[PDB]
Design a protein around this nucleic acid. Structure first.
Ligand code: MG
Ligand code: MG
Ligand code: MG
Ligand code: MG
Ligand code: MG
Ligand code: MG
Ligand code: MG
Ligand code: MG
Ligand code: MG
Ligand code: MG
Ligand code: MG
Ligand code: MG
Ligand code: MG
Ligand code: MG
Ligand code: MG
Ligand code: MG
Ligand code: MG
Ligand code: MG
Ligand code: MG
Ligand code: MG
Ligand code: MG
Ligand code: MG
Ligand code: MG
Ligand code: MG
Ligand code: MG
Ligand code: MG
Ligand code: MG
Ligand code: MG
Ligand code: MG
Ligand code: MG
Ligand code: MG
Ligand code: MG
Ligand code: MG
Ligand code: MG
Ligand code: MG
Ligand code: MG
Ligand code: MG
Ligand code: MG
Lengths: 72, 104, 55, 134, 174
RNA sequence: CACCCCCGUGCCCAUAGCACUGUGGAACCACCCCACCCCAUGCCGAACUGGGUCGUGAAACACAGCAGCGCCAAUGAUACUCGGACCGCAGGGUCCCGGAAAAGUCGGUCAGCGCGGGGGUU
RNA sequence: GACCAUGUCCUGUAGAGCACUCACAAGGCUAAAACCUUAUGAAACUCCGAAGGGGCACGCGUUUAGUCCGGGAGUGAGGCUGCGAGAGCUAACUUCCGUAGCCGAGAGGGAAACAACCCAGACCAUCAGCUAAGGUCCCUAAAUGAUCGCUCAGUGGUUAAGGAUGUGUCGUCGCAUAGACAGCCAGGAGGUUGGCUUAGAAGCAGCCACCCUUCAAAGAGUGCGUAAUAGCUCACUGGUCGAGUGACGAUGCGCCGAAAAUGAUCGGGGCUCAAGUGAUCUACCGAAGCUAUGGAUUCAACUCGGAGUUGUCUGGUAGGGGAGCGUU
């Protein structure tokens, strides 16, 4: 063994209560650990970036049912 | 099962586009076909077939579409999204769309 | 509230060091009056083991 | 005591027991006083001796079990390369976790059974009788 | 008897078997007990009976011990739970099992194991619950198991466990 | 939101779900009804689908009862831990202050809020 | 800026649980996978799940740092301790990471001695004062201090499994002025030289099983005995006897366990007629920390055309900057 692979510094890049420019990246994820609410659009590797400038808010009933909206 | 309708009604993510959606219920030919702004829990333009008659269901459906087109144009609406139900765009409902956008 | 340093800041984790510094006693044997505001009351609870709280 | 198939290696730590602080099954029993690993062989010696005291008996539950491999490095080698391969299995035994639990044998007989069964053990232990059990 | 100790008061080295709440729909109550004097009663009653307490204020309150929270490191009690008795078959209590006499397998066979030393049942009588359950094991043969289904249940008691579950069972030697 | 009830479509996002079950009937919905063709089945009008009344509330669905199940769930007590301060050679553990679960008991629920329409008391 | 408080969001550790995966404990059920009652472990298991922790916003509050831009660097070998892990043997003044602090770069008091530990960051001067850690019998500064005990071991002043009628403090179980525990005399029984055994096994090698008579009174019955019985004792019985005893337990301080190499020791003397100890309370000693008087620099405000006042600062390796002294 003695093998390993680079860190992928994934996360909630922008936490609810953070104003965001358009195109800011807010969550990094392997998949849909977050499912993108209103105003946000999710990319190829399933990072989801805000489309509209404003505050970031978490809709989060959880269990795969967590969504990131942006409010203007 | 009828995973046609939850699928087609998750594909109206473009209610985020601002257009209203136009539900239809090719059931008993009751084809009531409401128009809805989803943001409020509100519907804006009913067209139930209570006593419209008009004959066979495929043409009574177009009658429902042509009547609802006026019923919604009165209030000031023009953007449209045809949220079909489980039903195909097979004709008896397709007439509803033809007659509806014939006179928006 | 009355406050007096009676413990060195040396050898104590640096949050306690910037805590005493913003409290504004730079040497043991200093004292000061303090506001009742929860911010500074918690600023003093954080390093109460360094100080003699009087009131 | 040996585990029939696994994943290969482990690690270690301790804090007080959360599984099996109360006795069931038996009449009396025995409890640890000290955190520790216990090898397969320490179990088997307690079984051998308490089966010596329980001829034609059959009242010997063993409510513990070597789950954890522990792997000494080979002969004389400088450090470098893996944890060799496993040398023996051990069971974590935190205090208050029962090990042993007899039935069907009179108090002084079970008491002597537990004397010998503890003396082969690497820990303090205590015999208990059951009554504050939900 | 018990005194009030609401919130988190300190205890005497006389254990005062603290951390005791009695509850139903009505009211929650205070902790403080009288240490060994608790144990001297509990072993006699042992979940299958009730006894009144008299904190200052409430001169009486019946409860039947729901559960105990003993220390693990030093086999001693700590916290005890209680439930009030609203009477009129409301009681869901765990009766101890007991076995009578010589069995036919205790004659020539071997072991006589109680697989369920206690078993839960509802009691039609609230203030009258069995203190035990003597079982007539005399007539079983070696390798047979008395199932719960034929366990005597005096005075209209229901059985809160599986009819087919084994309770006692004779076992072969070795 | 005059009172109920039906078809639909939302918010909610198992305290709303399951099962047992009873009411429902041409008002609504639902099966049955026929198929060369619109249209379709990698075989079947079962599914879409097109042409309709009888018939029937069977099944499905709606709505009530329902605490067997699931779902939630205290208080209390712990586990643990932020800071402080200690003991044991060691594994390990204690104390002061404050935060504090999980499991279980007690107990809670077979929901709760809209919007448009259809037919009722005529 | 920084700490701290509020608000909010994100996390899958400790713990805890088996609901999936691997494992695994006693049974019931059965062509055993499966299934149920009961029972458990898990770095690569999670129905759950703190404490904390990070980002934002505010400052609803104390503070003084920050940011960028340009010149010069050095450093890129770390060391310990505590907490959390890995590797190791739950070895190492071991090796590798996280984290806090010290050391490096650190003087001063304590720890006999001692980079790391505990106290405390040295501008200068004083034959001034209060204290920290640590101390107060003599060395050696300062109570042979006070009060309730604890240990008679030099424990103190080197471990453990394990043992012990050692001793205090509680605490659970029995049998007693219808008179018990040792303690003296008195009896020891009945089929029965009891079934089951090897060659004989007969309280008394030993696998299987313990009921029944005669009795105020005795278990086919304890350790011994030659290979077997006797034999002196025992568990109940008794005149006497005259009042407490015996058992497992929690613990506080101690005993044993406990052998290495030039000569011993707690730093030494010596300490129980406390100089050990656990609990309390003072009174003082005790530092280059703090306070007093004097004094000078770094900075910054404040005044006059570096000066002076007030505050403040001044441990220091590589290094950067600044003012100056000496020689031709
Ligand atoms: Mg850990
Ligand atoms: Mg458990
Ligand atoms: Mg390897
Ligand atoms: Mg609580
Ligand atoms: Mg605190
Ligand atoms: Mg801590
Ligand atoms: Mg706490
Ligand atoms: Mg700030
Ligand atoms: Mg864990
Ligand atoms: Mg972290
Ligand atoms: Mg602002
Ligand atoms: Mg530069
Ligand atoms: Mg290097
Ligand atoms: Mg390092
Ligand atoms: Mg290892
Ligand atoms: Mg090293
Ligand atoms: Mg090295
Ligand atoms: Mg160096
Ligand atoms: Mg330093
Ligand atoms: Mg020093
Ligand atoms: Mg030393
Ligand atoms: Mg010295
Ligand atoms: Mg040196
Ligand atoms: Mg030095
Ligand atoms: Mg050193
Ligand atoms: Mg200290
Ligand atoms: Mg002094
Ligand atoms: Mg002092
Ligand atoms: Mg002196
Ligand atoms: Mg010992
Ligand atoms: Mg004295
Ligand atoms: Mg003084
Ligand atoms: Mg001084
Ligand atoms: Mg000075
Ligand atoms: Mg001067
Ligand atoms: Mg300096
Ligand atoms: Mg200085
Ligand atoms: Mg200097």
């Amino acid at each position: 063994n003695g093998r390993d692979s680079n860190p992928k510094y994934l996360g909630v890049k922008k936490f609810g209560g953070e104003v965001v420019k358009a195109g800011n990246i807010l969550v990094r994820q392997r998949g849909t650990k977050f499912k993108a609410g209103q105003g946000v659009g999710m990319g190829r590797d399933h990072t989801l970036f805000a489309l509209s400038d404003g505050k970031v808010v978490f809709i989060n009933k959880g269990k795969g049912a967590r969504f990131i909206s942006i409010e203007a | 099962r009828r995973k046609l309708r939850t699928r087609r009604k998750v594909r109206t993510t473009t209610a985020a586009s601002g257009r209203l959606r136009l539900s239809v219920y090719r059931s008993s030919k009751h084809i009531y076909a409401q128009i809805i702004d989803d943001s409020r829990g509100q519907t804006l333009a009913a067209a139930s077939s209570a006593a419209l008659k008009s004959g066979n269901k495929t043409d009574t459906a177009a009658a429902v579409g042509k009547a609802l087109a006026a019923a919604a144009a009165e209030k000031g609406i023009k953007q449209v999204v045809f949220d079909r139900g489980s039903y195909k765009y097979h004709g008896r409902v397709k007439a509803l769309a033809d007659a509806a956008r014939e006179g928006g | 509230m009355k406050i007096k340093l009676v413990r060195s800041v040396i050898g104590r984790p640096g949050n306690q060091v910037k805590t005493v510094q913003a409290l504004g006693l730079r040497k043991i044997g200093d004292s000061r009056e303090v506001s009742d505001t929860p911010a500074v009351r918690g600023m003093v609870k954080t390093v109460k083991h360094l100080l003699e709280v009087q009131e | 005591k040996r585990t029939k198939f696994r994943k290969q290696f482990r690690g270690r730590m301790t804090g007080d027991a959360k599984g099996g602080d109360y006795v069931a099954f038996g009449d009396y029993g025995l409890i640890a006083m000290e955190p520790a690993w216990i090898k397969s062989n320490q179990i088997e010696a307690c079984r051998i001796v308490m089966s010596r005291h329980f001829r034609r008996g059959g009242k010997i539950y063993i409510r513990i079990f070597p789950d954890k491999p522990v792997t000494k490095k080979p002969a004389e080698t400088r450090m470098g390369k893996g944890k060799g391969a496993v040398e023996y299995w051990v069971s974590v035994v935190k205090p208050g976790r029962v090990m042993f639990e007899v039935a069907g044998v009179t108090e002084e007989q079970a008491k002597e059974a537990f004397r010998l069964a503890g003396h082969k053990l690497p820990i303090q232990t205590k015999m208990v009788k059951r009554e504050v059990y939900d | 008897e018990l005194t009030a100790k609401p919130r988190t008061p300190k205890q005497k080295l006389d254990e005062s078997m603290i951390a005791a709440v009695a509850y139903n729909k009505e009211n929650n109550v205070s902790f403080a007990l009288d240490r060994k004097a608790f144990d001297r009663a509990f072993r006699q009653q042992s979940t299958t009976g009730l006894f009144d307490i008299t904190v200052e204020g409430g001169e009486t309150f019946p409860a039947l011990v729901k559960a105990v929270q003993m220390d693990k490191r030093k086999r001693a009690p700590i916290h005890v739970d209680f439930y009030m008795v609203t009477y009129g078959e409301p009681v869901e209590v765990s009766v101890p099992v007991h076995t009578t006499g010589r069995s036919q397998g205790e004659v020539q066979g071997g072991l006589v194991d109680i697989v369920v030393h206690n078993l839960q049942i509802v009691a039609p009588g609230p203030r009258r619950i069995p203190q035990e359950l003597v079982v007539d094991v005399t007539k079983m043969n070696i390798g047979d198991h008395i199932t719960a289904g034929d366990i005597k249940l005096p005075e209209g008691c229901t059985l809160a466990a599986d009819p087919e579950l084994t309770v006692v069972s004779v076992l072969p030697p070795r």
